[PDB]
Amino acid sequence: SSSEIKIVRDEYGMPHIYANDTWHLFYGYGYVVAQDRLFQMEMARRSTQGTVAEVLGKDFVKFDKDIRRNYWPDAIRAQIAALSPEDMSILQGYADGMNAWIDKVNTNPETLLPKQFNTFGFTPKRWEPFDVAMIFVGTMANRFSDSTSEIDNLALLTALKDKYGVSQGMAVFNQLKWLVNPSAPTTIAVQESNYPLKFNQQNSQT
Amino acid sequence: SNMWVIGKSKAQDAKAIMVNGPQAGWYAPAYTYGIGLHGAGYDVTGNTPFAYPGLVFGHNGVISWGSTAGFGDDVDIFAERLSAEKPGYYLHNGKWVKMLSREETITVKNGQAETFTVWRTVHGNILQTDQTTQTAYAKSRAWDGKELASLLAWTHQMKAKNWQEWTQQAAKQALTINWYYADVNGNIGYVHTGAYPDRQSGHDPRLPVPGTGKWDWKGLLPFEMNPKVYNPQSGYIANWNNSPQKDYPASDLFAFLWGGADRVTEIDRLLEQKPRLTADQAWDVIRQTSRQDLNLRLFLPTLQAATSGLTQSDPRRQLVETLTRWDGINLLNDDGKTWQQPGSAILNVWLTSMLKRTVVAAVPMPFDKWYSASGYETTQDGPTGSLNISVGAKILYEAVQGDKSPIPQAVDLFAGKPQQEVVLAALEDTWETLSKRYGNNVSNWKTPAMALTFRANNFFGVPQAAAEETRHQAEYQNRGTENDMIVFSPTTSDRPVLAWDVVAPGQSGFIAPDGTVDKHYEDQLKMYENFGRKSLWLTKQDVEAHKESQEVLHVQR
Numbered sequence A: 001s002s003s004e005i006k007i008v009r010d011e012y013g014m015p016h017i018y019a020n021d022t023w024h025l026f027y028g029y030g031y032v033v034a035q036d037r038l039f040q041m042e043m044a045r046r047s048t049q050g051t052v053a054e055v056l057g058k059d060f061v062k063f064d065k066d067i068r069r070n071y072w073p074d075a076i077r078a079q080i081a082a083l084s085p086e087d088m089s090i091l092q093g094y095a096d097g098m099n100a101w102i103d104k105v106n107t108n109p110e111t112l113l114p115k116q117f118n119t120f121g122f123t124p125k126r127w128e129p130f131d132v133a134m135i136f137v138g139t140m141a142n143r144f145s146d147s148t149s150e151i152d153n154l155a156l157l158t159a160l161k162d163k164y165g166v167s168q169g170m171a172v173f174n175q176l177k178w179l180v181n182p183s184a185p186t187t188i189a190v191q192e193s194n195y196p197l198k199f200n201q202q203n204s205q206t
Numbered sequence B: 001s002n003m004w005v006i007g008k009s010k011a012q013d014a015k016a017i018m019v020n021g022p023q024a025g026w027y028a029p030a031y032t033y034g035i036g037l038h039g040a041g042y043d044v045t046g047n048t049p050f051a052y053p054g055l056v057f058g059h060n061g062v063i064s065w066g067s068t069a070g071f072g073d074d075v076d077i078f079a080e081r082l083s084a085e086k087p088g089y090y091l092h093n094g095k096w097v098k099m100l101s102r103e104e105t106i107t108v109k110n111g112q113a114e115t116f117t118v119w120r121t122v123h124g125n126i127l128q129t130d131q132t133t134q135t136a137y138a139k140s141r142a143w144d145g146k147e148l149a150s151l152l153a154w155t156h157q158m159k160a161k162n163w164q165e166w167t168q169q170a171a172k173q174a175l176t177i178n179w180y181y182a183d184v185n186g187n188i189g190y191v192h193t194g195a196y197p198d199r200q201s202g203h204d205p206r207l208p209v210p211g212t213g214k215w216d217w218k219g220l221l222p223f224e225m226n227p228k229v230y231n232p233q234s235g236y237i238a239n240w241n242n243s244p245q246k247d248y249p250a251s252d253l254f255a256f257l258w259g260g261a262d263r264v265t266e267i268d269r270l271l272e273q274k275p276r277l278t279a280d281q282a283w284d285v286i287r288q289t290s291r292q293d294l295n296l297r298l299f300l301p302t303l304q305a306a307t308s309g310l311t312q313s314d315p316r317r318q319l320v321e322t323l324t325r326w327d328g329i330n331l332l333n334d335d336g337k338t339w340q341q342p343g344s345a346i347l348n349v350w351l352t353s354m355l356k357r358t359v360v361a362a363v364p365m366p367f368d369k370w371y372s373a374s375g376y377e378t379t380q381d382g383p384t385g386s387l388n389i390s391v392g393a394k395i396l397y398e399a400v401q402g403d404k405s406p407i408p409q410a411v412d413l414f415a416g417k418p419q420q421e422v423v424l425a426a427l428e429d430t431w432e433t434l435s436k437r438y439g440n441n442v443s444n445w446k447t448p449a450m451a452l453t454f455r456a457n458n459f460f461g462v463p464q465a466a467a468e469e470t471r472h473q474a475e476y477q478n479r480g481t482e483n484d485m486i487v488f489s490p491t492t493s494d495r496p497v498l499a500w501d502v503v504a505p506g507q508s509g510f511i512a513p514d515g516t517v518d519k520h521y522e523d524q525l526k527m528y529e530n531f532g533r534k535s536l537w538l539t540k541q542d543v544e545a546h547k548e549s550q551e552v553l554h555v556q557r
């Protein structure tokens, strides 16, 4: 059968999905996720789209504003819109899978609704590819690959130059925040190779 | 996050071993999600954060993969030129270009809704900080517009069968992440993947650049430039968020440095100590690194030189000798509250004193604050993340190395004072501080141990569970939020591959309306505590023989 999705869980509750095509495979993935971590994922969705204040209140307004100020929705949507059918099936199937379980949850809440929804006072809603993609964008991209303190660095350098003078200050900034350090233990050994690129370390853009 | 891959030349009773420990802090329910995919070209098993379509930690029976954050510099800030006479525009390439903007409304539970605008330029979203009538800063990411490509790359890589098919996917991952490879034949590999900007000549990637146009990136560097290695002659690949490669520049974070003092050495030491390691010995490294004080090895020699001419009746001498005899491996006392040895307490107090006397004294306020932390700071709940050598401590390390350090000491952190003198003075504070708190008998000192907490709030600080769902663990362990190991061609098994992981507190975070907790809600918590682990199945036969439940859905798109 091409419409079959078998879900076998192991002795630790870990699910194994079996399916013919792409859409069905990730449908089953989303389905088991909805069963295991619905409350976790819902709050993760709100954390990555900045809608926590909707259910938790005023203490999270600032958090919401900051999340929204750090990404651009049109951009994310356009990327999704550019996905080939096969790639789209990933996001679409995952969303659909979650929706199948969420529909059963809201159909029989007295037995299937995770207690946290009851405690926090709301019910879960349907997911779309955007939502699924945003989980990754927000908990991986925007949070582990979005690091910079360049403005602070310039303030430090500016202070060091005022205290020690121009050349000495520059040289001290290269002492506290060196660009590279040849004694740094590296994952790749020097016998293998080295990075060919050299960089300006005098803030010459000024 | 740490990772060590052991190739055929260093694997005992196997051809390759991979052990991964991603460190995102500890949460309940679990940071990652265990899942197995079979069909549509996928045949995989492992676990992944927030249940991404693509598994960050896993294998497919032919190869296995892992990650740790890369922390390369892939983000620059552009200083945009504004005009009061043209609200909403910025100067770029001699023209006033219209910024991108959008309205947002924050609906608030039991409160009034708030509306505001978000602005963006060709360089990136505008920061809500550092704002003037003439300037606004835009945050520029080399990975901008490639988020989905990275997600899809993390997924497609699961289907690779060799180094070439795999690197083809790593080339499409635009975030700054370390990818690792291993296979059934014993090949191992590493790629510091991601998009990195090709910068204008003279661009200091540590400081802002004008947004008027002359400083715009040339484009992105080629994949050829990404640090990578296949089957290193060392026979192993180890990483703990340290530098990928010689001469490779780190993130611009002021508190982030790749220097002579690096915690990854704690792993290289253990892997080189033994010519070959078995799966069990490789797994053991988690236990050892998670308990290893990271500063002992760095400053012990300085402490020994400074006190080498003291009599034994001087307590400062006695403190160093205590460190000399120590392996730096903390163990809990029977009270499940204190450490057997007072080493970390001694190091913490001394180090805190050293930084205040050196680095901190040379940096103008308020920036001095950035270099004062000893790296031991914590709260009752214990560290929210991994433990590391502090930025101030790394800078201090270059200083005590004297000319053995390749970093020119523009200014003497010891300000003309003999290093020994300052080191002895800090040792004096330590004895004073500690002796006054624990008595004068070091052999009976019971210093506080750090504990570990599985928090109810995700790393954003948002509740992902009820508070009551928080879990506690007596012993803090500087290890992965999850640990997984894949072993290829194990000689004691009938399978070409064996794998293990531990997803604590458990696979499920489900609680029924009446409060009935799922059977797999907490069945991996004790296992995490004692460095235990459970098998990951892949083959249909294995999954079948270990089945607990089944279900078959029938649906068409």
Ligand SMILES: C[C@@H](C(=O)O)c1ccccc1
Residues within 6 Å of the ligand: A144, B001, B022, B023, B024, B056, B067, B068, B069, B070, B177, B241
């Ligand atoms: C936990 C985090 C890190 O290394 O800091 C991370 C990010 C991406 C992949 C693995 C680990």
Ligand SMILES: [Ca+2]
Residues within 6 Å of the ligand: A148, A150, B073, B074, B075, B076, B077, B205, B206, B207, B252
């Ligand atoms: Ca930068």
